[PDB]
Amino acid sequence: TEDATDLQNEVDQELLKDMYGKEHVNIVFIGHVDAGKSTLGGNILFLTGMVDKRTMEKIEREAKERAYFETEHRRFSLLDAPGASQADIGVLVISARRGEFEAGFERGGQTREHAVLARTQGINHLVVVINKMDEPSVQWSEERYKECVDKLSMFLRRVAGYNSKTDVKYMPVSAYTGQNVKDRVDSSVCPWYQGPSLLEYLDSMTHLERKVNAPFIMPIASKYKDLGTILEGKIEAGSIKKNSNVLVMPINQTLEVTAIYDEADEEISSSICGDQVRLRVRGDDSDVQTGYVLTSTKNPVHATTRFIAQIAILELPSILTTGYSCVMHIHTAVEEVSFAKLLHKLDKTNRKSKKPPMFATKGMKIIAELETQTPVCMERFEDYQYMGRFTLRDQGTTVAVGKVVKILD
């Protein structure tokens, strides 16, 4: 039956940062020069501590014609507007100022071309930032915001097919004052908006195009019987439709997903990475257990018995090289692992270590080969974080933490 706790749920103490680095994301901003897409990016860089005030100004006036910024969980690389140049997130920046807003839809306007551009860039979930809310003509008026949103909603569907209820997130900001960019607008400034700030939304956003378009990956957290077999888990990559075949790795068994349900047991027709789902499946599932991974039949999640892994010892050990046995947990997995070619230590600045160690100890690290008794599904942490992140247990209460850096054979 169920899986009590993820490998994640069994970690604590902020040495976790520096090991498990922030998720890299590609973001592109679209809009008119005067709408302030350029002063938004600059203001994000400033509020987020990447540049000082003078440099942010420098950008405002050089915009008279590889940068990145961070939130708590993510690093956003800013792409140029018109793989490593496929955006995860598209942000269409629209001016709310009277006259300027309207102009974008009139004869001379660019907003049509901008929405067509977002579609051409693979942006199927558009973030639309309504900018300049602070200005004289807009005074954080809910009437103006609603008017701008309703118009954009009709127009974006017409010219580019965006269904606003499911495909578009609208958010008011002011890039000049930074209101609602990093911190939420204060209640005194805008009482009616009670959503997240732009950066807050960008941080926990689930629809990232590269990840959505990647091969399906879902570690199995549970297995029960409702009316047929049920496999519960969080989709780590890709997407799934009702009546889709999936592969169970590492056993190489195909199954059909006949139904999908969310955490509120309602039937939905599809789901993407970042969703917690419950999948009824059909076929030979007698060997399916937790820790196995539902995946694409075309480009399946990797599985191996051999890989390299950075690590961090936590408490009790003082135990031998080249053959230390404990339970490894990688996602919902729980298996069995030992060291083969103990290679490196590291400290402070993760340099490497010119000498392979003879043993482990409290507060030490690693970069070396590992092996299991039977294959387990995994990817590089760099590629799919939760598929490469693991904690070790020594028949009790923790002992290390690590990420995988290379798959072998």
Swiss-Prot record:
> Localized where?
Cytoplasm
Q: What is its EC number?
A: 3.6.5.-
Q: Which residues form the tr-type G domain?
A: 22-211
GO BP terms: cytoplasmic translational termination; nuclear-transcribed mRNA catabolic process, deadenylation-dependent decay; translation
Q: Which UniProt keywords apply?
A: Cytoplasm, GTP-binding, Hydrolase, Nucleotide-binding, Phosphoprotein, Protein biosynthesis, Repeat
| Outcome after substituting F359A | Reduced interaction with sup45/eRF1
Q: Where is this region: G5?
A: 174-176
Binding positions for GTP per the UniProt entry: G31, H32, V33, D34, A35, G36, K37, S38, N131, K132, M133, D134, A175, Y176
Q: Which Gene Ontology CC terms are recorded? A: cytosol; translation release factor complex
Which enzyme class, named as a word?
Answer: hydrolase
Q: Where is this region: G4?
A: 131-134
Q: How does it assemble?
A: Component of the eRF1-eRF3-GTP ternary complex, composed of sup45/eRF1, sup35/eRF3 and GTP.
Stated role: GTPase component of the eRF1-eRF3-GTP ternary complex, a ternary complex that mediates translation termination in response to the termination codons. Sup35/eRF3 mediates sup45/ERF1 delivery to stop codons: The eRF1-eRF3-GTP complex binds to a stop codon in the ribosomal A-site. GTP hydrolysis by sup35/eRF3 induces a conformational change that leads to its dissociation, permitting sup45/eRF1 to accommodate fully in the A-site.
The entry's family comment says:
Belongs to the TRAFAC class translation factor GTPase superfamily. Classic translation factor GTPase family. ERF3 subfamily.
User: How is this protein named in the record?
Assistant: Eukaryotic peptide chain release factor GTP-binding subunit
Native source species? Schizosaccharomyces pombe (strain 972 / ATCC 24843) (Fission yeast)
Full-protein interval shown: 215 to 662 of 662
